[PDB]
Design a protein around this ligand. Structure first.
Ligand SMILES: *[C@@H]1O[C@H](CO)[C@@H](O)[C@H](O)[C@H]1NC(C)=O
Lengths: 14, 181, 190
């Protein structure tokens, strides 16, 4: 009933 | 060749500002954008505000990861900066032009990149702020953007216009004239 | 001109025949180059350029991320489509039709009638020009579909013609928002 969204993947931080 | 194309996540984040944008699109139109500073979802149609809801917080969280990603890729690319593109400007009426009858001028700024632009209107050479409005940055398969500006107006034989576009990709401000022929 | 570093992430869904065929594609962009992506037709992250191996590798090495992404075809695409079905896909805005002469500037030694079809949605549309009892096939020229940005479209169809007393022209417009076609008439000489 509510809008869904893609979750942007996070680059690996060093 | 799909019957419908949707972007349930057009996420943008720039070092310049810094600034970003979060919106959803369906068949090339903006369903909504999230005011990042106010954390409020702004739907583009009464129909949408009435039947659908999207949590603004989700936009903020994604945008935060984009910032995380950008910094990392700036380093990976040896700080390769964006290339400026030349904007294509087109001005046209929303409705057939009939003198004395309220209308709206539409100024389309195509092939924009990076997404930083100044779109203002001129009425008989004078800056016009009232009745002016604009879309967010709409995406393009080539990864550039396009934005559309609006100017509500009363068609008059004694009044002409210019859509003023300012972009680093232009040697100087661009002016696209328009008048009720 | 300042230097700008731009990042873009696009979560896209491609629909064909209701939800018969659905394709999911997430794109990671640096400035204007898509350096990494995920396409549901293949099922694994891909470095599209030499700028993406650190990313594709990182994400492919994580089981839950691959599964979760793969599942977004349903939790995101198919999910939102349901919301799109009872809103966007059923939105109907009838076009207003207008006919007006070419003006001047010469339309090529041959006059012009302009049938402007405005403020309609969805895009699908059919416009036809008639001269009395016959349909005009030649001398007709149309502008591409024009997107106003406010969820409405516009399109212009000119017909090359020579005004002659008696002749009558009509513009027939067919759109999913009207059961009957819209028919506007313009009479030469009057
Ligand atoms: C950035 O510099 C590193 C090390 O000098 C090099 O390996 C890499 O190919 C460079 N990449 C770009 C986009 O210049």
């Amino acid at each position: 009933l509510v809008e869904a969204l893609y979750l942007v993947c996070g680059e690996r931080g060093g | 060749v799909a019957d419908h194309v949707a972007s349930y996540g057009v996420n943008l984040y720039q070092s310049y500002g810094p600034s970003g944008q979060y919106s959803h699109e369906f068949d090339g139109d903006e369903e909504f954008y999230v005011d990042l500073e106010r954390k409020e979802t702004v739907w583009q149609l009464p129909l949408f505000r009435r039947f659908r809801r999207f949590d603004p917080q989700f936009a903020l969280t994604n945008i935060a990861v984009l910032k995380h990603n950008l910094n990392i890729v700036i380093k990976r690319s040896n700080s390769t900066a964006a290339t400026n593109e030349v904007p294509e400007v087109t001005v046209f009426s929303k409705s057939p032009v009939t003198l004395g009858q309220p209308n709206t001028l539409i100024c389309l700024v195509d092939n924009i990149f990076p997404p930083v632009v100044n779109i203002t209107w001129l009425s008989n050479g004078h800056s016009v702020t009232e009745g002016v409005s604009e879309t967010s940055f709409l995406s393009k398969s080539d990864h550039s953007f396009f934005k559309i500006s609006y100017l509500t107006f009363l068609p008059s034989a004694d009044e002409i216009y210019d859509c003023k576009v300012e972009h680093w990709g232009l040697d100087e401000p661009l002016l696209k004239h328009w008048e009720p022929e | 001109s300042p230097e700008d570093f731009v990042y873009q992430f696009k979560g896209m869904c491609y629909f064909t025949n209701g939800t018969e065929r659905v394709r999911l594609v997430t794109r990671y962009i640096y400035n204007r180059e898509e350096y990494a992506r995920f396409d549901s037709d293949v099922g694994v992250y891909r470095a599209v350029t030499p700028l993406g191996p650190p990313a594709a590798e990182y994400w492919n090495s994580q089981k839950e991320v691959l599964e979760r992404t793969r599942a977004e075809l349903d939790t995101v695409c198919r999910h939102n489509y349901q919301l799109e079905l009872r809103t966007t896909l059923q939105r109907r805005v009838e076009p207003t039709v207008t006919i007006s002469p070419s003006r001047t500037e010469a339309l090529n030694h041959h006059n012009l009638l302009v049938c402007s079809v405005t403020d309609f949605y969805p895009a699908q549309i059919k416009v036809r020009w008639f001269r009395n009892d016959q349909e005009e096939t030649t001398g007709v020229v149309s502008t591409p579909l024009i997107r106003n940005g406010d969820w409405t479209f516009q399109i212009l169809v000119m017909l090359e013609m020579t005004p002659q007393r008696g002749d009558v022209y009509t513009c027939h417009v067919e759109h999913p928002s009207l059961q009957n076609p819209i028919i506007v008439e313009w009479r030469a000489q009057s």
